[PDB]
Design a binder for these strands. Structure first.
Lengths: 49, 185, 141, 57, 193, 124
RNA sequence: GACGGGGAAUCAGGGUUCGAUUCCGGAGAGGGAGCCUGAGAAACGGCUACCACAUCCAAGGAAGGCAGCAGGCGCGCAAAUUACCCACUCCCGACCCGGGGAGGUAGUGACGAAAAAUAACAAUACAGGACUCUUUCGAGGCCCUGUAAUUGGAAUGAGUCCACUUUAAAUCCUUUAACGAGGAUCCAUUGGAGGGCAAGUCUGGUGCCAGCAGCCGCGGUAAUUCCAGCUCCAAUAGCGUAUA
């Protein structure tokens, strides 16, 4: 048939890439708005403060 | 201090002359005639023939009325007539030196499947052996380098699971029949 | 054999021992001076850093500019010259870079029309010159 | 010209000729079968000198 | 622990396999003398220490991707090399100059920025203790303008044999635990030379 | 159909079982599961199948020959006495404690670090 | 750049080189020195001081020696998992029952060895060879042999995936369901083509430059040796290079 590309190694990773992006995109869908993580306190200043 | 074997040996030998016209011509004639694959198999046949000839020469060096020479010569001669390279008429220790490569290569499984009368060509015989069709005495053998003996000569037949000897049809036949039934129903 | 007697064995053994010592190929491998003077130190391959790209010239019959490189060793710091083997590979080697250096194949002797070289370059920057020649690997940066 | 010490000049100024789409050469056992056929089957009784397998006269 | 991670590096992306996850006690910081504990899995919003087998060239401040799949061919790092081909703030000019060495990548980058502002080239960017190889590379540069034939080592210990070989053929190591003391020593050395 | 044949059969009065070698013949079909050999030896020797222990079944090249062992006990408690624990775990008769070796070794070392009655409470 | 031996490679006959390396014996636990206990130790996963290195320290003091199993640094041309189990083989103890990085199992693994895929068949295309004659045409070609991206059905394997089997539990192999190929894109590389030494006086580009070349030698604006294309040759899942 003539639907896909010529070789296999330049298309077999596209299924893995689409699986990764749909897995992460669904991971951006079902999210909880309460009981989140811990933030970062980020301390800056001058010498000898 | 582990429990292994570490015992192995090379079964072939590389010739001293890498480029000789007559040697390459003879080796390629043997490969084409007896359906070989490469030069390592005819080299290993040459190596085991050289080992047998060297053992026969070392046995023939010693004098007669020796129990070691008589026992080893009788064992070697009985094994060679059991394999099928000699007969009962030439039952002598000094007749071993007249044996050649084609006497060993005649006893190969591929040649015997070809010449027994169930394969078209020798390459077709090797292909039929390698795809698990030919069995000897209810044992499926899928390798062409199986040195048959004289007592197991008349038991070469297709396997019970092969379509050639009576069995289930293969993958192409079943798929084509399914396509025909789908198109006609 | 000259001393041919029944109980003459230590004379024959000592004479053959001194005449075996009085050789060149056996004496080269049984004295530590040849191994210590060898920059490889009895090793097959060696590593080194490129100092500069030099150009040496061929001998009397044929005339060309055989392009080499001055490399100082890792293990001892001896300073040798090494011939870049194939065509156009002098772009692949820059100064202060790691190279893997092997011999020509004549056991520490000059090969061909190049005077004074005994070594050749196999790899540069831990990647082979054959892959760089055939467009199979790229130099990392 | 440019210079006498130009590295890799003949590799860099030669013309680029692309590859050709050729049939897959069979490798393994049947290659020896083809070699045996072409050497010791299709031989013709000739005279004088036998030409080589790459004799493109 | 049974997965492969992809970390950005100097010679492009490098793929490793995780060995352990060292966690300090919550009372102390991460700059502690080997007081850690082992874990199999970690919770979110934590400062962990991933240790591997062969990285030895890494740039911090860049994302890492955990591949749950099998990295059978290096093409799943294409978005990561696309992310590193833009916004290269710390451009590594591998020119012919002073071999610098620091115990930390941040201190090493600060030393490189000091040399950039001081208009001094740099050759080697090795991280960790000073060995015989670094002194030997300084001995390589002891020919062909030997002005930059010194080793800049900051907040890290030199070995005994490295100093023993260094003083034999004249490689200077400015070993200092104080960065401005190291700066003043290098400036005084340059003026005296 | 599937048939089995015994080989090298012997009785053991001093260990209260019987050793045998089982030659399973299954042409066409795959290797039969061990409960089939157990119930076949049950209805072959007229015995309850709770004392039939079979193991070590390797299928020969050729599709239809399988060689394995078999233990035929005369009692259930006698089979409980002289038997490795993993076979009784396979028949669902024995259960093992699920603790890895590293935890046990670390607990042993932590109990080694302290003396007295505190060994009881240092390792839970 | 010496642990010894049983041994290993090459090998007509005699010899040459290696043996750190799973079995036997000897020696050491950074290197010297001394000792308690015990039948058996000058023991180091026992102790006491010296030197070299080195850890914590509220600075008074305290704790050490992976040439054991994993792992890290350096050294380099040069060498793997900071896994599972005591089930098998044995060993120690009060003792059928506990323990064993002794050991077994798996992972990495092209040190090396053994077997073995990358195809066969049928009809036409067009080339020969054998048979009384047609001397030379052409047919008989009923018996063939070769190769042509012409066609056609008939086979099984690598891989995916149920079960069974193995095992302490798995994994590996074997068995076995269901899918699984025509340009069977499910695509075989490494060297070489002047001689030694198997194989183009082919076609384009440079012109003692670039380069090839183990040795003879090849390049000077018609290169059988350079750089590319086609064809061919040697071995084949293997081939080339450097050192002893």
């Amino acid at each position: 048939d003539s639907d896909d590309d010529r070789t296999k190694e330049e298309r077999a990773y596209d299924k893995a890439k689409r699986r990764i992006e749909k897995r992460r995109l669904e991971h951006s869908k079902n999210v909880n708005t309460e009981k989140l993580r811990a933030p970062v306190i980020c301390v800056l200043g001058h010498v000898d403060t | 201090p582990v429990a292994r074997s570490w015992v192995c040996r090379k079964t072939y030998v590389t010739p001293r002359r890498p480029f000789e016209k007559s040697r390459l011509d003879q080796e390629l004639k043997l490969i084409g005639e007896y359906g070989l694959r490469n030069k390592r198999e005819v080299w290993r046949v040459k190596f085991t023939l050289a080992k047998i000839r060297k053992a026969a020469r070392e046995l023939l060096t010693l004098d007669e009325k020796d129990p070691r020479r008589l026992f080893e010569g009788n064992a070697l001669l009985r094994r060679l007539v059991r394999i099928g390279v000699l007969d009962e008429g030439k039952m002598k220790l000094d007749y071993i030196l007249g044996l050649k490569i084609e006497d060993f290569l005649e006893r190969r499984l591929q040649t015997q499947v070809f010449k027994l009368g169930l394969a078209k060509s020798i390459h077709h015989a090797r292909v039929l052996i390698r795809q698990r069709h030919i069995r000897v005495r209810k044992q499926v053998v899928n390798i062409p380098s199986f040195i048959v003996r004289l007592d197991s000569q008349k038991h070469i037949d297709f396997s019970l699971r092969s379509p050639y000897g009576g069995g289930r049809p293969g993958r192409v036949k079943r798929k084509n029949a399914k396509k025909g039934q789908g198109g006609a129903g | 054999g000259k001393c041919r007697g029944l109980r003459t064995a230590r004379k024959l053994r000592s004479h053959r021992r001194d005449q075996k010592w009085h050789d060149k190929q056996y004496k080269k491998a049984h004295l530590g001076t040849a191994l210590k003077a060898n920059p490889f130190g009895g090793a097959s391959h060696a590593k080194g850093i490129v100092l500069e790209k030099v150009g040496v010239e061929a001998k009397q019959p044929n005339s060309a500019i055989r392009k080499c490189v001055r490399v100082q060793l890792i293990k001892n710091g001896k300073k040798i010259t090494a011939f870049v083997p194939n065509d156009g590979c002098l772009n692949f080697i820059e100064e202060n870079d790691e190279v893997l250096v092997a011999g020509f194949g004549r056991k520490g002797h000059a090969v061909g029309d190049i005077p004074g070289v005994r070594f050749k370059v196999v790899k540069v920057a831990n990647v082979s010159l054959l892959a760089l020649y055939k467009g199979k690997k790229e130099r990392p940066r | 010209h440019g210079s006498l010490a130009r590295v890799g000049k003949v590799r860099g100024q030669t013309l680029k000729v692309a590859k050709q789409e050729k049939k897959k050469k069979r490798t393994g056992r049947a290659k020896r079968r083809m070699q045996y056929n072409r050497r010791f089957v299709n031989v013709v009784p000739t005279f004088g000198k036998k030409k080589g397998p790459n004799a493109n006269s | 622990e049974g997965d492969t991670i992809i970390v950005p590096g100097v010679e492009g992306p490098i793929v490793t396999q995780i060995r352990g996850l060292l966690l300090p006690p919550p009372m102390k910081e991460l700059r502690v003398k080997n007081q850690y504990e082992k874990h199999k899995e970690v919770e979110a919003a934590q400062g962990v220490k991933i240790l591997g087998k062969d990285l030895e060239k890494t740039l911090a401040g860049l994302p890492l991707l955990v591949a749950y799949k099998e990295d059978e061919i290096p093409v799943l790092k294409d978005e990561l090399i696309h992310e590193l081909k833009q916004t290269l703030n710390a451009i590594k000019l591998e020119e012919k100059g002073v071999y610098v060495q620091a115990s930390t990548l941040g201190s090493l980058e600060a030393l490189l920025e000091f040399l950039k502002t001081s208009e001094v080239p740099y050759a080697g960017i090795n991280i960790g203790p000073v060995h015989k190889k670094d002194v030997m590379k300084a001995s390589v540069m002891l020919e062909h303008d030997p002005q930059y034939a010194v080793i800049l080592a900051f907040d890290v210990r030199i070995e005994r044999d490295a100093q023993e070989m260094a003083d034999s053929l004249g490689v200077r190591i400015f070993s200092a635990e104080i960065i401005y003391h190291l700066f003043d020593a290098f400036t005084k050395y340059r003026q005296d030379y | 159909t599937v048939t089995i044949r015994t080989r090298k059969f012997m009785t053991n009065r001093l260990l209260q079982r019987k050793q045998m070698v089982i030659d399973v013949l299954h042409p066409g079909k795959a290797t039969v599961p061990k409960t089939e050999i157990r119930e076949k030896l049950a209805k072959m020797y007229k015995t309850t199948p709770d004392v039939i222990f079979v193991f070590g079944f390797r299928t020969h090249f050729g599709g239809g020959k399988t060689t394995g062992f078999g233990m035929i006990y005369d009692s259930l408690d006698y089979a409980k006495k002289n038997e490795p624990k993993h076979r009784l775990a396979r028949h669902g008769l024995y259960e093992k404690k699920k603790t890895s070796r590293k935890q046990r070794k670390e607990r042993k070392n932590r109990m080694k670090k302290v003396r007295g009655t505190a060994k009881a409470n240092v390792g839970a």
